[PDB]
Amino acid sequence: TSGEAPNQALLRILKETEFKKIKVLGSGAFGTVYKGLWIPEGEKVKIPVAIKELREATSPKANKEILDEAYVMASVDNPHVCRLLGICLTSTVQLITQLMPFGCLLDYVREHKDNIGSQYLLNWCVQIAKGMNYLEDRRLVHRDLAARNVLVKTPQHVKITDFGLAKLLGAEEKEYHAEGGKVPIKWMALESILHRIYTHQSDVWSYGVTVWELMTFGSKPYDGIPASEISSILEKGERLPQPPICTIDVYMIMVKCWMIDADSRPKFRELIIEFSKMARDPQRYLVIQGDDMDDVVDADEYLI
Ligand SMILES: COc1cc2ncnc3c2cc1OCCOCCOCCOc1ccc(Cl)cc1N3
């Protein structure tokens, strides 16, 4: 191959018979996420799943985006990345993925802030750095890393999801150039705002904002600031403030992800090392007051 490696991920087409929706987890304008049970026919297993369905197939552009997402989700495999189990084509395109029962990490930290200690926070930081580093290996720029897009399998185990903006860099490319469409401005590197240039180092900036979300127990970045005003305030030198529980050691890691020169920001592989060292003595780096279901198989244990 004159360039990249053949993507031999498998795309599993699942029968609608094989799974049963249980509850709505959430509805948007473009569709709904359900929780359900998948039961591969020949297997004596029931697998808890989230089922993400496009509301109405009457939007070829939409069907094209959700299939782009499924391509990406089908091609990743890492303990800290959400992988696609299969798709269902019935009338509405449905993505089937492993159910992450505690939901997204942003709502988790807001709901349980009075019971979240430094060990958890720094461990999450390690696990997200691991997921992102693995995506960097796969030459994949996420473009929407945020605490809303980290899911909670258990309080000890989180994974990166929402690959709807993710782009695959080529072997001869280093940057992605996008063209319109709503983008999460308050998580975007300055180069992404100004020139719509995206890089793994652009993702590192987003990682900085995501850590800041966690350390503030789900605070909104630049709360009350118009998204249009963000470009200018970031040029002037302004950054997110030091969260109360953060030592200078941790806040300085966050600030380095927000260096204007993108190459002098940390590598995800370095963020793994630094937070892992910190997670080894958590109270030195965060200061927090008070520190039939018989055939059910989690998806991480169903491997075909
Ligand atoms: C317990 O609540 C939930 C558990 C889930 N477990 C697995 N997957 C979920 C889940 C969604 C849940 O609540 C909906 C709110 O989510 C917050 C935003 O989500 C970002 C992206 O999420 C996805 C992206 C692609 C696919 Cl195929 C599926 C999901 N969603």
**289 in a labelled binding site:** no
Identify the helix (H) or strand (E) that includes residue 108.
helix 105-112
Query: The CATH number of the domain where 140 resides is what?
Result: 1.10.510.10
Copy the structure tokens of residue 168: 């695959």
Task: Name the active-site residue from 144, 281, 292, 300.
Answer: 144
Q: How far is the CA of 104 from the centre of ligand 1 (A)?
A: 7
Q: Is 19 annotated as a binding residue?
A: no
Q: How was this structure determined?
A: X-ray
In whole angstroms, give the CA distance from residue 150 to residue 81.
9
* Domain co-membership, 160 together with 235: yes
Query: 206 labelled as ligand-binding?
Result: no
Residues sharing a CB contact under 8 Å with residue 304, sequence separation 6 or more, in sequence order: 40
- Please indicate, yes or no, whether residues 27 and 160 belong to a single structural domain of this protein: no
d(CA 184, CA 88): 29
Is there a catalytic annotation at residue 144? yes
In a domain, 138, yes or no: yes
**Residues near ligand 1 (Cβ within 6 A):** 25-26, 33, 50, 52, 95, 97, 99-101, 103-104, 148-149, 151, 161-162
162 Cβ partners below 8 Å, 6+ apart? 144, 148, 149
Ligand 1 centre to CA of 26 (Å) is 8
Cα angle 129, 131, 135; round to 5? 110
Angle at 10 between CA 8 and CA 12, to 5 degrees: 165
CA gap 136, 146 in Å, rounded: 16
Q: DSSP letter for 104, please.
A: B
Which residues precede chain breaks (C–N over 2.5 Å) in the chain? 291
Four-residue CA torsion sign, 246, 243, 133, 237: negative
DSSP 249-295: HHHHHHHHTT-SSGGGSPPHHHHHHHHHHHTTSGGGTB--TT---TT
Residue 92 identity (one-letter amino acid): T
Is the four-CA dihedral 226, 231, 234, 240 of positive or negative sign? Answer: positive
CA distances from 100 to 45, 148, 154 (A): 18, 13, 8
Is the same domain home to 164 and 65?
Answer: no
Through-space distance between the first and last CA atoms of the chain, rounded to whole angstroms: 28
Q: Is 91 left (phi over 0), alpha (psi -120 to 50) or beta?
A: left
User: In the 8-state DSSP scheme, what is residue 55?
Assistant: S
Q: Do both 152 and 236 map to the same domain? A: yes
Query: How far apart are alpha carbons 300 and 83 in whole angstroms?
Result: 10
Token pair belonging to 273: 């090392």
CA-nearest of 148, 153, 18, 11 to 79 is 153
Instruction: Write out the residue range of the structural domain in which residue 21 sits.
Output: 16-100+300-301
Q: Are residues 107 and 79 in the same domain?
A: no
**What's the token pair of residue 224?**
């009350």
CA gap 225, 175 in Å, rounded: 28
In this structure, the answer to whether residues 91 and 107 fall within a common structural domain is: no
- Determine the residue of 27, 30, 33 to mutate for testing ligand 1's pocket, defined as the one with the most ligand atoms within 8 A of the Cβ atom: 33
Q: How many C-beta atoms lie closer than 10 Å to residue 154's C-beta?
A: 10
Distance of alpha carbon 44 from the chain centroid: 31
For CA atoms 183, 146, 83, 44, the dihedral sign is negative
Instruction: Please check whether residue 24 lies inside any domain of the structure.
Output: yes
Beta-carbon contacts of residue 147 (< 8 Å; ≥ 6 apart)? 104, 105, 106, 109, 210, 213, 214, 218
Contacts of 293 (CB under 8 A, 6+ apart): 46
- Whether residue 6 lies inside any domain: the answer is no
Q: State the distance from the centre of ligand 1 to the C-alpha of 219, rounded, in angstroms.
A: 20
Count of domains forming the chain: 2
Same domain, 206 and 185: yes
Pairing of strands 84-89, 93-98: antiparallel
How far is Cα 240 from Cα 254, in angstroms, rounded to an integer?
Answer: 9
Atom 19, ligand 1: residue with shortest CA distance: 149
Q: Is 164 labelled a binding residue?
A: no
Q: Are 49 and 96 in contact (CB under 8 A)?
A: yes
Judge if 92 and 125 occupy the same domain: no
- Domain assignment present for 295: no
Report how far ligand 1's centroid is from the alpha carbon of 99 (Å): 8
Taking CA atoms only, the protein residue closest to ligand 1 atom 1 is 103
In a domain, 45, yes or no: yes
Rounded distance from Cα 303 to ligand 1 centre (Å): 21
Q: Which residues contact 173 (CB under 8 A, 6 or more apart)?
A: none
Residues 3, 264, 253: CA angle, nearest 5 degrees: 120
Residues 55 and 118 in one domain: no
Tell me the one-letter amino acid at 210. Answer: T
Q: How many other CB atoms are there within 10 angstroms of residue 155's CB atom?
A: 15
Does 184 map to a domain? yes
The residue among 34, 86, 95, 36 whose CA lies nearest residue 63 is 95
Return the beta strands (E) in the chain as ranges. 19-27, 31-38, 47-54, 84-89, 93-98, 140-141, 150-154, 157-160, 167-168, 176-177, 197-198
Structure resolution, Å? 2.5
The Cα 208–Cα 121 span in angstroms is: 14
| Domain identity same for 29 and 119 | no
- Which of 161, 162, 165, 187 should be mutated for ligand 1, with most atoms under 8 A from CB? 161
CA–CA separation, 53 vs 175, rounded Å?
A: 31
183-198 as b/e, with b when 16 or more CB fall inside 10 Å? bbbbbbbbbbbeeebb
Q: Report helix angle 200-215 to 248-256, nearest 10.
A: 150
